[PDB]
Amino acid sequence: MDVNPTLLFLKVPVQNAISTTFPYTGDPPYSHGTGTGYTMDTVNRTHQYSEKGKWTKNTETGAPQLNPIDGPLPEDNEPSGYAQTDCVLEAMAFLEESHPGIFENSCLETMEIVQQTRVDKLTQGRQTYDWTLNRNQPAATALANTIEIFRSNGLTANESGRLIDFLKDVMESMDKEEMEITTHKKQRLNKKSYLIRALTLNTAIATPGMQIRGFVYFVETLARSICEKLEQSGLPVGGNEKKAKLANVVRKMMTNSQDTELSFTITGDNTKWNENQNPRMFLAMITYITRNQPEWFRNVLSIAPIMFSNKMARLGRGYMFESKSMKLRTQIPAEMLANIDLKYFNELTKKKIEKIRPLLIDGTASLSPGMMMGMFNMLSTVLGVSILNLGQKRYTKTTYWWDGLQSSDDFALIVNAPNHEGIQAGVDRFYRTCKLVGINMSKKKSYINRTGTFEFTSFFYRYGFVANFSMELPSFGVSGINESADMSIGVTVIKNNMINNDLGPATAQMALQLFIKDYRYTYRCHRGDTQIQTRRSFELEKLWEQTRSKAGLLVSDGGPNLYNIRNLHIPEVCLKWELMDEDYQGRLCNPLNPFVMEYDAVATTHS
Amino acid sequence: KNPALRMKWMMAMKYPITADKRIIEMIPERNEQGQTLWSKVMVSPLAVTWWNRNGPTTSTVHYPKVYKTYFEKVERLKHGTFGPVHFRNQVDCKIAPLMVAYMLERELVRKTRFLPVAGGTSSVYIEVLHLTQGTCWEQMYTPGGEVRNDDVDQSLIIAARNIVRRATVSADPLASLLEMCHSTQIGGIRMVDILRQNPTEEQAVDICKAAMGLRISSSFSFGGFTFKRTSGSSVTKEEEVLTGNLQTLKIRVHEGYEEFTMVGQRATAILRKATRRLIQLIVSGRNEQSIAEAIIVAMVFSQEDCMIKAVRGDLNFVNRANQRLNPMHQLLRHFQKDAKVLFQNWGTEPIDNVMGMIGILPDMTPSTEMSLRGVRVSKMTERVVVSIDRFLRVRDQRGNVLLSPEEVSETQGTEKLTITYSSSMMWEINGPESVLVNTYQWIIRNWETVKIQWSQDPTMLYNKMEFEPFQSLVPKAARGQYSGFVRTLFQQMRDVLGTFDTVQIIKLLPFAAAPPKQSRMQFSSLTVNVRGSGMRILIRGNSPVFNYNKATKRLTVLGKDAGALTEDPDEGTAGVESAVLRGFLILGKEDKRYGPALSINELSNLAKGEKANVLIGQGDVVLVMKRKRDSSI
Amino acid sequence: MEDFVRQCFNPMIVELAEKAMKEYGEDPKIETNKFAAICTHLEVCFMYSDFHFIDERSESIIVESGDPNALLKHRFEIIEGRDRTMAWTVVNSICNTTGVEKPKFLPDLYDYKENRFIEIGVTRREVHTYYLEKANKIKSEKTHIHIFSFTGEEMATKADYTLDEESRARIKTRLFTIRQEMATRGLWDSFREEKFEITGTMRRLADQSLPPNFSSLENFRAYVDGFEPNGCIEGKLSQMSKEVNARIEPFLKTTPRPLKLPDGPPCSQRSKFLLMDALKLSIEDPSHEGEGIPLYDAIKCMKTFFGWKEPNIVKPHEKGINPNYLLTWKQVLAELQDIENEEKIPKTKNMKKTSQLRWALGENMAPEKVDFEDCKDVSDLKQYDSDEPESRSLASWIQSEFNKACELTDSSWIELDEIGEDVAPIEHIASMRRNYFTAEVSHCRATEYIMKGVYINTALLNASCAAMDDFQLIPMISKCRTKEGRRKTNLYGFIIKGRSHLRNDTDVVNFVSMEFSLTDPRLEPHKWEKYCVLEIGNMLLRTAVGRVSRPMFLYVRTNGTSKIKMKWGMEMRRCLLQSLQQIESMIEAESSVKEKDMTKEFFENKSETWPIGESPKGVEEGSIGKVCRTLLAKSVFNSLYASSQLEGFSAESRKLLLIAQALRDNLEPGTFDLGGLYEAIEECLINDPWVLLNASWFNSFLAHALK
């Protein structure tokens, strides 16, 4: 025999054994795509998809800017960013018409959110770009540095603590004629230099600075409030709830799809999603959502697209040149790409550098034409849902009508029609109506098959059964805080992982076994019976001898584990209560210790 | 950061923990073995266990109040009540406010939750969501609320249910049930005594009572509901009927105007019948599904023509132990699996306004103008001698089955008082950590007969049923290879006159109750699986699973006690041990004259009659002599 | 402050209030009044909704016993405690079911009797002022506003109190109790337009960020505010070229095409330790556990072999340093001899830093860093990895590797710990599945690779952290429990670490790996491109005719790894969990379709088989005991041979696999661009042996499935 695991699919349907095809459960030990090359390539691609736009020069920043909106209509089945403002506005007007009051209610809720949110909410995030250091630092450090520099320059409204006051301070800073940055070094940035520093993204392959994040948060809050009311959207939800939507849509399109009405599902994927969405269009739709609203609300919500459309991008670390005849390894920083002779590089990199050189200003590269991944993730979904809403059979005025699900570059479209020509026309109307708004369907990553089976953001649906493989197995190891906290965390991980990320009972039990093994091997607390000889064994042995109710000992006191599925939500010290010896209870939980969702646990001598 | 590796490295170092500066005033500076506990403050982890071992005791009676939430959760779980695991296939205006409420709730479940789920939304259920529901299954689970404080009737019901559910699968149901009931005891009191005294009306308890010949109620149990007759009387015609798939069935049809009060666990009903027709039925339930199942059972019991032709599948059902059940139960189970066809084909007709009784749901949700036939939702005792059949089917003088092992619920409760199931065939109900204890206790309590049969008729002793549960624990892959090995050893205790150790027999006997397989391996430890962990029983020595204390002459199995052992007069005294190696006799202690010790893998190269030393166990060496005569079963 | 509201209210309200605080970014510790107000509002809403149920056409029920009833339903639908998206779903369902204007904001309740949404409030502020403020904020008729007060004052629109007087009295008593307790604690008395302009640089950037035609943000906003759908999509769809279309190419049984694997010299071995060509110098029953000192077992094992001969190079590296690979072994032997002569085991042997180790480790080959200014003229400078995707064709050695990795062994490599009792039936099913799996995979060579990798990476990371500037000799030990119950201590070879000043977790720590083995290099010289294979001994092996002497080889190579790789290898024990998840999902799908627990028809049924092989007879079917190991070996090899090509291929071939599944199911699959999909799949196949083998498996599948 020659073992061929793929041949297993000859017996079990693919969606049943789909887990076989996912190689890793964890972050691989390699970096897939990053560095100066993959950033310059992205810039060049974003500009290429909009090459037939209008070129201008930004008065303040002083960098070339490409404006494809209302550009020539596409002529071939290739990506194009030439979004049409009329088409997008009409689509959003129709979305409002089909869901009356959605925009008004969302705007009111977001407006209430704006006047309360504290600046602290801006530190609960991920790595952020420090305009004061040209580096990346965690959110809290970036916010603290920005606030310190703002105070040193006279801007102090952020002391109020509201995020909107911090935004007002940011806008005032954008108007100052010179910003003084004193680091634990004395430097002064003129208006243009600071403006560039605040309109830059470093290397989701890019993280926005601190000025942008404030407005991005509010824009995405409005986007989330809009999405929560759209059944088509599937971004704001997760876990079991998402599994409902899939079924729901298949039920909507198959209620009476039996009178010869052929139904077909397109499992799709939008090509170059981030490199075609135009921040100018996001402004064009935010100005529509925030209609007949207080001018301050529109002004605050319109400043994220305005800052993106002028955004610059830092290329990256740079290149590394190796001379194998001299055994030399030198590095070229990205800032020197504007003058270095184009002979060292290979042909493809040489072409990339040549194409990007005209856009290089102050070491960055203007990236007006398109958005970058990770930002405006929930506002893009609204455009997609609006497109999906244009197949309601009252907006097509024909016999074919589509309606499906979309989650920001992942969609499934159901195209009920009365015959195959109807299906082939309802797919073309979607692929064409969806090009006018700058969304490019990927023809090499999609497929259409009769309804009853498809894939949507790794939720494989087959004849009513949904397999959820979107999220990965969490690390089932000791947290590393202390003996008491680790048991509480590790067990809770398995519990809430079973609840949210569908995890089998048997695999849950084996994960618990592996966790107990790691726990006992970190803190030397093997079972009393077990003969492992560590430095802590002797004390654990004697304690085993003198305890009559050996079952009540904590797992950290050389006792027996008692955790199965039914009791993963109960803390150890409260699970093993009736089983403890009264003297042992007193000794463990004595307030005279010389020693003493997260970590929900009881305090004992172990802490 | 990677805090896990940091914590491992810290725990590696001595004195990693930071403690108060008063530790010297409380804990010593060195333990009984001289291992230092603290320095300068910095304390080794050994102090954290020294405090728990020898430290200032304190009263902790207040913690259940300080942490009342956690202990409330623990108490809710401890009194839990598990049902069966259900594997579910995922396949202006009038509008009265009550209709609004139904329509709404029925609409939310559609777009709110994916898995159908029966019911439960309060936090008492949400807290155990990781257990109740999964990808494609449900784990029906009644929370451990406060329901009475019997503490004796509950334990009796649990014991009776366990006995019936274990006997229904045995070779002879009635004999096994009588054996188990005559041996089990709850709260010290023997089970038969409480059975005689208790008046409880549980299905399993009533079956057990009928087994003893005691008198039980005349009520008729069916589909989990008790149809207490209230008026009328008739005869069973024992006729035949044909189904939708054209499968003839031999049923017992009734007649006459009969009034039946259907009591249940979570619903009640009043039914009138006359010759296979539902004249008038009233219901009063708790949940929508409770009422749904109540009417399903009532209609199945009505034996109506429309009900019978409503079948849309194969009426083939299997009881545990591969039995076919009865046609009435077949229909009930089929119509419990599927509901819509039965209800829609049952027929509908208009209602007349009556006090406090809404019309049934024709489907899904109730209605106030049209209801299914003669069914209306609403609100608001003698002993007859019986006889049990072989398949625990209680019957009356009329011959109509009253209680059967299918009426007993699957509700696996938790015993309140301590229930001891003395007898085999039930040591599996308790944890697998108890099967070993009970097996060894049984082997000891019957030591004389076991010894006689071992020395006379070993094969019948090996093929004994009392060792079957033990065979569940032993790994399947090596289940047989052990037997052969052990069997061979025992033969070498019957051939080599003078060698006889009781402890070895009582230790290795249960391992020799499987079809033997021959191999050339010299086992050092026989492994057995308990609670997912593979413990070992050493062939020569003491193990946590089996420790024999010579001083007190007592056997300890997994910490618990097994009993005491006497000494056979034939017990060998020369020290020669024969059942420790496949073809060798351990002639005594280390003998440096014969040379350095040989690993147990090398002694297989010794020729007949050769003698050498071998490392036979933990830092131990013994002299072994190869047997010239080779013995094998 | 922080204690009362915590204690007097049930926890659920506490978590709800904290969730609201996180929503607004607020912290419970920083503030008191907002938390107290939120908890009070939540409790008031719940006690209003928990008032009582409905009945048949009479409503206004006042029953409170605890027995649910079908015809008795809650009169008030909770909305405050419901999730945002789900709350909007509920309110939309209300509006669709019965005609009532959608409230601008999320209300608190939906009393069914009056069919009117109910918004409730409670605050110390003057009742009339609060009611007017709420009427202004929640500005809509056909709704209801109900305002309470701690002082004992209530109000509602139209003076039409919905519920009964007794329940209102209960609410007032609860409020009075709260206020009185708070006042007795010094808490009660503690409780007592927007402008944003775009000007200057932001105005000039907003006017510069519009659609081409427009000039100023004011003009753009004026246009947008006056937009009305006039059929703009229709005209532009009419004007757009007909070539912009997605024609559905049919996908038939003949369309599928075998993938095109690369062409070139055969692929070479890439792992970090010999997988199947591994030989162990194991000792039985080392003597009591306790993680025996690795360097003591590494000597007690090498004392078990007496066939050491003069090392001889049988296969050179052919682009490397052979003599210094030989001398590193001849120095390891000497160092191990010195440990024996010394008293007590050092517990860590730092190797003498000599030219042999420096060169073998590559420390003397690494290029020196130079600033670009100095090396401008050097003509050999080129972008690193300028072009080296050398394509290498598939070889059979990887298939043999997997074949041997799917086989049983005579040992027990994974010894898991215990679990609590199994009470719930679902617990019984889970335990049955887990026990069957662990029995089928405990004895297996995939588990041997898992544990060997875990041990090696752990002992390498620990030494790389502790001793950062020493060449520390590291044995490659593993421990198993033989089928007879006696523990062993296998030694596979040695690892010599190099300088390990790892600051960022991507710096490489070059190390020399020297494995023992019996597999002659000359049989597959193309598989050992990266190794320098020696001949170190002559081992006697039990052949059929007598006992034959066969050579014992040592495989030497200068490898390198970083903290990320070490951490990814130390967790290889997750391969068991991944494989168990795969098997259990396979069981769960079948059970769901079959409406019963298929845990038995899978594991205990000697007839069931799955096609997982291919022999000259045809497709070969194994038993569940072979699937459990095949999937485990597949996962272990995904972890060992992890690469970007593997991820790309697995992502891109799953779409083709699903199209094939749709075809086999007769769903009339159709693709918009299949050539692009095939090109994407074949772009990943370059030189990775594992991905090439996977592509070959895919070809074989397609061939058998669509035939």
Residue numbers in the entry:
A (entry chain E): 1 to 184, 208 to 226, 240 to 632, 655 to 665
B (entry chain F): 41 to 80, 89 to 139, 195 to 483, 491 to 743
C (entry chain D): 1 to 192, 202 to 716
Reproduce the article's own wording on this structure.
FluPol, composed of the polymerase acidic (PA), polymerase basic 1 (PB1) and polymerase basic 2 (PB2) subunits, transcribes viral genes and replicates the vRNA in the nucleus of infected cells. Replication of avian IAVs in mammalian cells is hindered by species-specific variation in acidic nuclear phosphoprotein 32 (ANP32) proteins, which are essential for viral RNA genome replication. Here, we present cryo-electron microscopy structures of monomeric and dimeric avian H5N1 FluPolA with human ANP32B. All experiments presented in this study were carried out with H5N1 Tky05 FluPolA with the PB1 K577E and PA Q556R amino acid changes.
We next determined the structure of the Tky05 replication platform, comprising an asymmetric dimer of FluPolA and ANP32B, to a final resolution of 3.2 Å. In this complex, the active site of the FluPolR PAEndo domain is buried and thus cannot perform cleavage of capped host RNA, i.e. FluPolR is transcription incompetent. Its orientation is stabilised by the arrangement of the PB2-C domains: the PB2 mid-link (PB2Mid-link) and cap binding domain (PB2CBD) pack against the PB1 palm subdomain (PB1Palm) to form the product exit channel. In contrast, in FluPolE the PB2Lid flips over to mediate the stacking between PAEndo and PB2CBD via its C-terminal α-helix. To assume this configuration, PAEndo rotates by 70° so that its loop stacks against the PB2CBD domain, sandwiching the PB2Lid between the PAEndo α-helix and the PB2CBD domains. The interaction between FluPolR and FluPolE is predominantly mediated by their respective PB2 and PA subunits, forming a large interface. The PA-C domain and PB1 β-hairpin of FluPolE stack against the PB2N2 and PB2Mid-link domains of FluPolR, while the PB2627 domain of FluPolR interacts with the PA-C and the PB2627-NLS domains of FluPolE. However, in the replication platform, ANP32B interacts with the FluPolE PB2627domain, while we observe no direct contacts with FluPolR. Of note, the canonical mammalian adaptive residue PB2 K627 of FluPolE forms a salt bridge with ANP32B E151.
